[PDB]
Amino acid sequence: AIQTRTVINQHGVSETLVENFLSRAALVSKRSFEYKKNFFKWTINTRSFVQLRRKLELFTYLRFDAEITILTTVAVNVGLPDLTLQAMFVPTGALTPEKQDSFHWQSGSNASVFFKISDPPARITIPFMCINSAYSVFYDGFAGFEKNGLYGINPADTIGNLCVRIVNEHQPVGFTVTVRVYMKPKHIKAWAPRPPRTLPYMSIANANY
């Protein structure tokens, strides 16, 4: 426990701006699947890891873009022949595939990328797809009207989900695929600051303690 000092001279103000307070491309999903549920489905919620959930709940309303980067690292359970993947983005109102060889992967209307393993990782940016003017982080209301609706789910707030599939046919080798997704918020406009949370989180759906 050595107690030191150093004088500090600074001039910068433009480092605490909200535009470059949240532009850091944190990890948001990490899930494996074995191919021999044979695919990766993930809703595009942001409150999955508590390092970025607490930082994002200082504000009430904010507005941004997505900038998804999918990084796939394969293995054989020695060399793998030229694997090709598909990463289809399914918004609301379009149906999600339930099986690997479904007819929903052939749907033209929703956007899809086709990237090899040997390439640099895939990258698409997703526009602001709320039907309000901003994402309500905290919603003090009920989607379900009558007496039984889940508290604090805004029906206008949802984005979609993305689905990742090995394109190739059944091969005599069986391999394990690990998918990591990095999201980088762009063009931030944040409103109405709020006090930060001290007690630890208990669920993904609500603010219990």
């Binding site: 905290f138 989607a143 508290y151 930060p196 603010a207």
Partner: protein, 233 residues
């Protein structure tokens, strides 16, 4: 020294200031013909009346009170009737909180207004039901006021628009609230934007026992409008 607004008038206050929450007034929907294009009826003379609520009791062991502002007026008066048979509204509010004690009482309140106050249940994995939120005119009570019933501390709760009622100096507070929502018009029976909450930081005391020190809350919708119920053909 009186607030004559329409039909009623809260008279004989102490000197007070219209501290606007943030920097704006109601504004009356400047230009949106792209949404709900039946022009809003905009009632103005028959809603603005200072609906005074019930007087609440402040004792030594009391712990706090909260009201949901579009919810506290759903069953009261002319604003309460327009919530039925209309499904879109747009209004800002005005709040006047006034307690009254003599020169031998001591204490302090924090009158804060919280936008989008999503509550939380203590020590369980179940979200709060419909009956723990839509309490109504009677309001509620903080179970754990130090964490504002959602984990965010009370020491940092002065980031919201707030005033202090310090019984040594004053006994009145006044907050004006603009339209704080992402959508231009909202649904009154299932969404509650603001949440008026008053919390005694320093509890009261006197030589005798449990003086009431009753408090009064008065709410008035500022620049309200609704959808159109009358059309040509």
């Amino acid at each position: 020294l009186q607030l004559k607004l329409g039909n009623s008038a809260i008279v004989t206050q102490e000197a007070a200031n219209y501290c606007c929450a943030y920097g704006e007034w109601p504004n009356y929907l400047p230009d949106h013909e792209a949404v709900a294009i039946d022009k809003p009826t905009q009632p103005e003379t028959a809603t603005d009346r200072f609906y005074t609520l019930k007087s609440v009791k402040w004792e030594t062991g009391s712990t706090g009170w909260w009201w949901k502002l579009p919810d506290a007026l759903n069953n009261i008066g002319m604003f309460g009737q327009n919530v039925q048979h209309h499904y879109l509204y747009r209004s800002g509010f005005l709040i006047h909180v006034q307690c009254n004690a003599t020169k031998f009482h001591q204490g302090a309140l924090l009158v804060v207004a919280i936008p989008e106050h999503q509550r939380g249940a203590h020590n369980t994995n179940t979200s709060p039901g419909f009956d723990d939120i839509m309490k109504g005119e009677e309001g509620g009570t903080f179970n754990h006021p130090y964490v504002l019933d959602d984990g965010t501390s009370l020491a940092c709760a002065t980031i919201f628009p707030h005033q202090w009622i310090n019984l040594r100096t004053n006994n009145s507070a006044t907050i004006v609230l603009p339209w704080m929502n992402a959508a231009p018009m909202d649904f009154p029976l299932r969404h509650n934007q603001w949440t008026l909450a008053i919390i005694p930081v320093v509890p009261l005391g006197t030589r005798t026992t449990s003086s009431m020190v009753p408090i009064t809350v008065s709410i008035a919708p500022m620049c309200c409008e609704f959808n159109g119920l009358r059309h040509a053909i």
